[PDB]
Each structure stands twice: as C-alpha cells, then as structure tokens.
C-alpha cells in the first residue's frame, strides 16, 4: 500500500488518491469486480488465484429466488 507517509491505510482497506497531492483511505474496501464480460464467474464470486472463482460474503440471502 504505497501512498506517501502522511496518511496510510490500516486494516482491510485500500489507498485512494485525491486531487490535492494527498492520499487517503477508501471507506469501501469490499465488493468484487471480476466477470470477464460474463463468461466464467460473474459478480457473484471473487477472482482468486490458483484455483477458481468463489465468494466469502453474502450468506443466507435466499438462494431460492431468481427466475
């Protein structure tokens, strides 16, 4: 997490840039972004290396839906 020495990002977070030459912490260090134009694993799972796509969050969200 290389973002100067003024303000770093502790815990499970991500360093975001600003428009004042200063770096801050992002309050939204979650959610996936892997889908590959929908071909293998959509936005329902996470893209993990050495293996396959799988999620860790979103549980008991009623998987008996969809149509």
Domain ranges of the chain: 1-67
> Quick check: 22 and 6 in contact, CB under 8 A?
yes
Please tell me the experimental approach by which this structure was elucidated. NMR
**Long-range contacts from 32-35, C-beta under 8 angstroms, 24+ separation:** none
d(CA 13, CA 27): 7
């Amino acid at each position: 997490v290389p973002c100067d020495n003024v303000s770093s990002c502790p815990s499970s977070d991500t360093c975001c840039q600003l428009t004042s030459g200063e770096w801050g912490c992002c309050p939204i260090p979650e959610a996936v972004c892997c889908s590959d134009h929908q071909h293998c694993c959509p936005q329902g799972y996470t893209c993990v290396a050495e293996g396959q796509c799988q999620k860790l969050a979103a549980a008991l969200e009623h998987h008996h839906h969809h149509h």
